[PDB]
Design a binder for this molecule. Structure first.
Ligand code: HEC
Ligand code: HEM
Lengths: 294, 103
């Protein structure tokens, strides 16, 4: 029968401008509720939501993926590796009421694109057309990664999303943003110092800090640097794999490059599993609040 | 502005990288004690990007506020990883706090 086919369908006569408006709403609100999480803002959490809703994809049968906006069903919503994202869901329900035409899938991803651009990351082309799908399309819990693993679980977990080594190392640089919260996941601390602005700190920290493995209070082990940062097993594993390590060095050295691979990957991540007819509009590049005088 | 507010803004947005107490230890960022009245790039035994040194501006509540709005626009090449405070109150509230904390 072959896998399922998910054709992107533009929302009835909407266009860039209709979508630049959604961005602006999201963008502004990130400017407005800036107290969240000790002033980190809603940035990190929205980029994490973007990733989780997309990370359920399975290229073998094409199930999961951003398409269906199924994170909105309890099954998915309640997946334990999804702890803490309710905070991201709430932040956009308002905006959803404002624009009830956009699908759930189009909102969760546009949101991560806004947060990256709004935190000064690179521009991320984006496309619309995700369509909402019945409660039955909800992926079972468990398609998302474990933190407590090594380079090899990582390399393989990612072949399921169809990503290579360079794409996996680039994606991980997103670990420059936010931190881990012990109540959410058993780990605690930030990867770096600028938790809300997008740079390549992730990679300089990985290689310039002095990491020591230790146990947190949740009783898990993590790598702590004297400077107050932490690295999860899966992050550290990036410098123990000879092959991951040369991409990590590239990136610590050249932000533009990182910036270019990340954008290519992040978008590839968000569009996985979706077929765009040859008549759909070219991907959009949205303007920031800065670029609009704000 | 309010210096109780500025205080939480500083604890929330600057503290991860900077101390204000005297003798205070540099972190990612320099110890900010006696910032105001000094030239940019002078803290001792802290390594600054040449960019922070070569801009040499006296830190007065005014050039300081332009800086916080957008650290990379102000001192391109700076390595301080901050997006900036887009809100005047915030800027007021913080500076005022700093004014007082970095005496
Ligand atoms: C890291 C994530 C930081 C955050 C968040 C904040 N600061 Fe920062 N600061 C940081 C660095 C690494 C540096 C030096 C940069 C360089 O290019 O060398 C700075 C520098 C400053 C300065 C200038 C110091 C001087 O000229 O001697 C000031 C006045 C300053 N930082 C203040 C400041 C405030 C008020 C912050 C939050 C609102 C803030 N910093 C965040 C590292 C980091
Ligand atoms: C091996 C794969 C990965 C693992 C095991 C993993 C694990 C984690 C964990 C355990 C946390 C902290 C959760 C919390 O306490 O809230 C986290 C946070 C986060 N993750 Fe990852 N991650 C992976 C890949 C990614 C990717 C590919 C991206 C993005 C493009 C991403 C983006 C983020 C961000 C932005 C945060 C911070 C969220 C916040 O501040 O609330 N992660 N990750």
């Amino acid at each position: 029968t072959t896998p399922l086919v998910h054709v992107a369908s533009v929302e009835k006569g909407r266009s860039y401008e209709d979508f630049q408006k959604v961005y602006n709403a999201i963008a502004l609100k990130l400017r407005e509720d800036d107290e969240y999480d000790n002033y980190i803002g809603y940035g990190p959490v929205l980029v994490r939501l973007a990733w989780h809703i997309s990370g359920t994809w399975d290229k073998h049968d094409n199930t999961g993926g951003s398409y269906g906006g199924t994170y909105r069903f309890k099954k998915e919503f309640n997946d334990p590796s999804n702890a803490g994202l309710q905070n991201g869901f709430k932040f956009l329900e308002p905006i959803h009421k404002e624009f009830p035409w956009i699908s759930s899938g189009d909102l969760f991803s546009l949101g991560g694109v806004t947060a990256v651009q709004e935190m000064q990351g690179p521009k991320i082309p984006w496309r619309c057309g995700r369509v909402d799908t019945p409660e039955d399309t909800t992926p079972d819990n468990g398609r998302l990664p474990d933190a407590d693993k090594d380079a090899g679980y990582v390399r393989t977990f990612f072949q399921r999303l169809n990503m290579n080594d360079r794409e996996v190392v680039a994606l991980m640089g997103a670990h420059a943003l936010g931190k881990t919260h012990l109540k959410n996941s058993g780990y605690e601390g930030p990867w770096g110092a600028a938790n809300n602005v997008f740079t390549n700190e992730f990679y300089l920290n990985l290689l310039n800090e002095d990491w020591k493995l230790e146990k947190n209070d949740a009783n898990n082990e993590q790598w702590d640097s004297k400077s107050g940062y932490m690295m999860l097993p899966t992050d550290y594993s990036l410098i123990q794999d000879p092959k991951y390590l040369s991409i990590v060095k590239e990136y610590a050295n050249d932000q533009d490059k990182f910036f270019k691979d990340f954008s290519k990957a992040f978008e590839k991540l968000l569009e996985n599993g979706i077929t765009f007819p040859k008549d759909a509009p070219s991907p959009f590049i949205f303007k920031t609040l800065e670029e609009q005088g704000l | 502005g309010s210096a109780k507010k500025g205080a939480t803004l500083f604890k929330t947005r600057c503290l991860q990288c900077h101390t204000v107490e005297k003798g205070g230890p540099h972190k990612v960022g320099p110890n900010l004690h006696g910032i105001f009245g000094r030239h940019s790039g002078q803290a001792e035994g802290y390594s600054y990007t040449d960019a922070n040194i070569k801009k040499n501006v006296l830190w007065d509540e005014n050039n300081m506020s332009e800086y916080l709005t957008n650290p990379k626009k102000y001192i391109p090449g700076t390595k301080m990883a901050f997006g900036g405070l887009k809100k005047e109150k915030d800027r007021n509230d913080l500076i005022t706090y700093l004014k007082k904390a970095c005496e």
